[PDB]
Amino acid sequence: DANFRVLSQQLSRLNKTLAAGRPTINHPTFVGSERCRPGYTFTSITLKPPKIDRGSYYGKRLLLPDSVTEYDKKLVSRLQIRVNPLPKFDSTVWVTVRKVPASSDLSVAAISAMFADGASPVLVYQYAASGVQANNKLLYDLSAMRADIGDMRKYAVLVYSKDDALETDELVLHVDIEHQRIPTSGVLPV
Amino acid sequence: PGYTFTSITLKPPKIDRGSYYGKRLLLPDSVTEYDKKLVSRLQIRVNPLPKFDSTVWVTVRKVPASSDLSVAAISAMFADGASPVLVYQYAASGVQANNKLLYDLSAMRADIGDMRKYAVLVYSKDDALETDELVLHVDIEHQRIPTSGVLPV
Amino acid sequence: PGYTFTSITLKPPKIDRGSYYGKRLLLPDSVTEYDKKLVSRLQIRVNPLPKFDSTVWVTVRKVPASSDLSVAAISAMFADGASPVLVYQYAASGVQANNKLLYDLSAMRADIGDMRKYAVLVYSKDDALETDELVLHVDIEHQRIPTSGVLPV
Amino acid sequence: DANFRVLSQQLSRLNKTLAAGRPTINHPTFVGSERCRPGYTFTSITLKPPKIDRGSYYGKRLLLPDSVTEYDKKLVSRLQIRVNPLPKFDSTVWVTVRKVPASSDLSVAAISAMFADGASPVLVYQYAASGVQANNKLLYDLSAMRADIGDMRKYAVLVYSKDDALETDELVLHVDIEHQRIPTSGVLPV
Amino acid sequence: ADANFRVLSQQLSRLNKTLAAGRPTINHPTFVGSERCRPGYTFTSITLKPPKIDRGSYYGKRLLLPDSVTEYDKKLVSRLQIRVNPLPKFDSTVWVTVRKVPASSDLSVAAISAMFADGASPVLVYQYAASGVQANNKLLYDLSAMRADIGDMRKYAVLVYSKDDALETDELVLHVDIEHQRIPTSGVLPV
Amino acid sequence: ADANFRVLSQQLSRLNKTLAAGRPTINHPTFVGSERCRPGYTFTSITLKPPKIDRGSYYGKRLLLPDSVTEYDKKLVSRLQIRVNPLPKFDSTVWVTVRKVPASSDLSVAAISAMFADGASPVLVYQYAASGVQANNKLLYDLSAMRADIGDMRKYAVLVYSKDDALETDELVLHVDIEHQRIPTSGVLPV
Amino acid sequence: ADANFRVLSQQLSRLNKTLAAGRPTINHPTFVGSERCRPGYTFTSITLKPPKIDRGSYYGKRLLLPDSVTEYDKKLVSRLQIRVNPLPKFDSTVWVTVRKVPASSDLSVAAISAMFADGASPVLVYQYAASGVQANNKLLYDLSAMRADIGDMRKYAVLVYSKDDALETDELVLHVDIEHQRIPTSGVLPV
Amino acid sequence: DANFRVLSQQLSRLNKTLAAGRPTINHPTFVGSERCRPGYTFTSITLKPPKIDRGSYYGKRLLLPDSVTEYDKKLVSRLQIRVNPLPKFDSTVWVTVRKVPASSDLSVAAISAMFADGASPVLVYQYAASGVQANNKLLYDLSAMRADIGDMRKYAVLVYSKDDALETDELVLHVDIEHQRIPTSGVLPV
Amino acid sequence: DANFRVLSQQLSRLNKTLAAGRPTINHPTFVGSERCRPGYTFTSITLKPPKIDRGSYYGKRLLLPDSVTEYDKKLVSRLQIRVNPLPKFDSTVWVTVRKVPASSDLSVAAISAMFADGASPVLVYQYAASGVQANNKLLYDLSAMRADIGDMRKYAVLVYSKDDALETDELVLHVDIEHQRIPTSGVLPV
């Protein structure tokens, strides 16, 4: 009665925390996702860079599929970076989800300056001969800002191949975005 | 109730004068994974972009023999006259009675997996139905999509 | 209520230009054994498969004199104009007002046995009505089929 | 009061059992059917073999009329074999309703092996000059398996003429199938 | 004896009928006995005589009635009965059946042998034995559930099949006994 | 209904089984029906094929089992069963017996005909008749009193005797159905 | 202990499973142990053998079943499992995945490497190390929320990828263990 | 309460009586034995006649095995005749268990006179081509006379082959005797 | 009072689980045994293979010492594999405790097929220059099957040297078996 309740919420924090990243049998290599919030669903984006040079920076503005850009009032809870590696891979990548002011600036070599301030978390990923890296999944949160789908144009993902010019089929990227449900029909279609 | 109107737009390629056409009901794969879900009534719609001057004998049912091929053997299948047929020769908004028909399955409950066995069968009669003249629509009714509660892994 | 819609599909054979046709109402034998059952309203429907270009003067009533033969003596029977007639010269889904008429018998209660005495009478006017052009439908209403509780012996 | 009730159910078993097969005046030669269950109705199949050879085996998969194959979700309570003899008859037949795995095997001369295991009851029928055999009606039950009309494709009837090549008009066969009511209309037909 | 022995008495009375279905009782030692007519209804017989059909030939026959019966074509028909009484000189075989032919919707030529096959009605066989005369030669086809009348008795048709011989007209008689209500009584002053 | 109709209900239920021991019931019209397996136990079949022994020759055969069954040789055996299923071409005669041979204490050469004589076990005959196929071809030998197990099923031996013919291998199949407990269920993570 | 220690007991029992997710326990010191089958369901294995595909080649394979399982295609499937058991001579690498291919809507030619990219399913890697054998080689993909049956097991497809070598057929076996309900028990008298 | 008890004993008589001889599935050809009484056990005798002539009478005095003849005070409840047929058999036999006065008379052709009086039941057995005879088991009762094992010498079995001289291996006979338990040991053996 | 009791049993699970394998000071290199159950004792077997070839499979049926094989009714709780390494060791071994059907099959090269099904846990052991492997002790449980000492003949241990032909003195094996107490004497010996 409101005394074991606060103790139960303390221990449930430790169950999440002590199982942050360990090779659990439900997903033994790559770290598992967290559950979508009741309400919201997800929506993916596969972005393909052009063949940029060896060790070159890369800028990319976030667009969306056009069925999503209709309802530009619904909120965006969190967004996600998946970096799924296909087998032939020896390179390194850094991924970042910073806020570029929209069309206030370019993306030419000031991107390497944008890695320096650290206003956002930075996802590294590197090849090891010892084994594949277990943790390749960043979650950048947005629930405090109450942003919407209409503000998703403002953000920009920043990619950096370092030790190689990235071949277009050595490592795919993804930007998964969690927003509310696209509104359901039910009217008589004409 | 509990339904979000799944639209599939399937345009048929080019016909000659007095020739048939068949095409099977292939759906998006977010729907096909919901194979158990009960399927209510369905309808078709014929929306022409202008440059249109033609008329059609569109009718859809299950193709027998588990989807044997659908050219010139549906000529016997248009010879029965069991289900009604939509004939569009009006070319003005309102002169046509209706763009739509009915194929209810509430007692049948032929599911999403049974939509693999259905095939739109098309007859054309005039002008051989050149490019961009009509845009066929087929709208189905089937119990509401359960969304995943897990972000991609 | 209490009724399952008994459909009988009777296509008429080939006519000449300006000739009549008659055919009696024969039903499936699972229905004819239910002779006592009360019969409500009935209707006809004209569904053409395409290749169709014709028009008809379909009208059904009881043939008198206990089914005397039904060629060229129904020309006087189309000369009265008592019951309405369906004329199909539209050839598009919705341009026609209606494919259906009405012959209610709720006060008459002319039973299943009295369906032996009815005869579809057909007039054709254009194109002599060649093969597979129209598929006639006639749908009746009559108290619900009692199924047997005994497996075959 | 719940004491003669159990005695009444015991004696009613004996009324069925002691009248299993006797030439009752309601049906004096062939054994009578049992009543269809409240709910279910029946549906017949007359199967006609091709002219197979003298003493040859015979396989046949169960199909249905196409009006039945629509509602392939409704249950099948029991199925029945009638072997009605027409007058000119001197031969012998064996009928069996086994479960063949669907398209996992052929039906060529392993059918005589399928008579041997005895996983299903076997209906014999033979001519006698002493008189016509009184019992020519097998009931194979299916209420425990909760099978449907969609599983009726899986079964196969196995026929064996023994002492003769079967003429097509010396003995008819039937497969009567008891399933639920094909769903009633009541909508305004168009 | 208060609604608890009553249900036990109705169970045992079923067994008295059932265990005495066919046995050579002393009240009728060779042919199986009839059942009692229902209170109300009476009976009415028909002797039908086929023409000399060929050896092993099928035979169709529509049910007519005597004309005094065909007047009151509204009264119900409870059950009908087939008696096959054998006269002494007999060695042949017969099959009798009481099926529903759709009235004038079809003929009776050699599709009768197809009508034996479906089994929608019970089939009465009868055959000679040198071991003795067959004890059971009496079919009762019931009609109380359909609520048919005398006016529907035209629709039925009896189907006869001599098998091992061409039937001589005086080797075996047939009968169709029909149980319907009482033909209405007079009592008016006749003129 | 308080411990006085209970004993009367158990008496009448004996008569329902007994008076329906063998009669051509519509659920199985020719061969006698099986009895229900006990809650718990399941069954397991054996088809045995003799070599072509001579005309009227005896035959011995020890009971083996499939090797998946011989693992759990501690579980009990409730009853065992003989099915003799006839295929159509058949005119011969067979006798089947389920006696206890002492295991490897003796041979099976022509003392088998002496083993038919003592009658310590029931003997299933089966013979062809032109009058018709024999309705009863199913022996049940009980074992619930001895509390034997699957490990003792090696000790028994089935004894077959073709009499009027040398048995062709495809005129009549035999079976030995054995009712024992459930082979133990898995549920562990397989590796 | 009244609905207040009950919720605390369920919290700590989560930590006993979680803190013992993978550690070399003495009950199974090298390969991670299975979880217990649910009360009800049993298991059924499949050993799949690829043809000799090339070095670093993709591989597609549709899930079939043994034919005794494909009979009862109405019973549910709780979970399915991937075991990758290594035999000793092994230096290669494999990736195993249990994705949903739409049934006969597409081929399996080199779009399989695209199917690794979306990440709608967990991906089991396995690689040789000279430091030692990898302790975790057992994926469990769950299906209890979808209420799928045995009849839907045809729709799934396992995706294998040898990477650093052309896979010899006897360097590493694969398995697909499937947990579904009990195949229905007999108990009827066998004929 | 002592009113359904007498009704239960009436119906249990009918269960035995209506199942006197019918081919039950527990023993389908030869009629089954009855249960030994609590107490008593059984003891068998196989008797082998010499090759007597065609249609000849046969006398045989009842002896016992010598382990049984020790305790000649214990009672004899009932005795039994089994006539087990081996396959090659076409003959006929009559078996009878009469009381011959011990050494007061011979057994030469007055045995056929001993069949005539009918003071004991007579078991016939005959071959039929229609099938093997189902009933081949006589039980002669002795519980009223209170005889013992010492009086079993007085009885004599009477066999009559009729249609053939009996070959010694066409049909075996048996005399099964139900008496009390031969007394159990338990002393320290020396 | 029956509420801290269930919490105490939850935490005691975590004390075992979080101390599954760690280098505790009571046994710093090889993982410790678990306590024998009250009742049962243990019994060892050292098995010595012949010099099989390089990378060759190996089969071996479980026998026992003859003093144990007397009381073949007593139960077997669990059995154990110890793989004790002596110093000169660079090879690799796999050990498995599968159920071979007794004399139903050989052990020639189908043993490598028996590794594939995974019906039993598989103990690997490999040399590392980084250090000796800490976990070399499999426990296969048998308490659910209620097997006895008489069924220990049915099992077979499967050994596989992989990278070398095993010298007979580079690595010993053991099979420790936990069964009940061999029955105690106390009678006056003669």
Residue numbers in the entry:
A (entry chain B), D (entry chain B), H (entry chain B), I (entry chain B): 29 to 218
B (entry chain A), C (entry chain A): 66 to 218
E (entry chain C), F (entry chain C), G (entry chain C): 28 to 218
Paper's wording?
Here we demonstrate that VLPs derived from Cucumber Mosaic Virus can be engineered to incorporate an internally fused Tet-epitope. Vaccines based on the resultant VLPs (CMVTT) are stable, immunogenic, and elicit strong responses even under limiting conditions. CMVTT can easily be linked to any antigen of choice via chemical cross-linking. Cucumber mosaic virus is a widely distributed virus with no toxicity to humans reported to date.
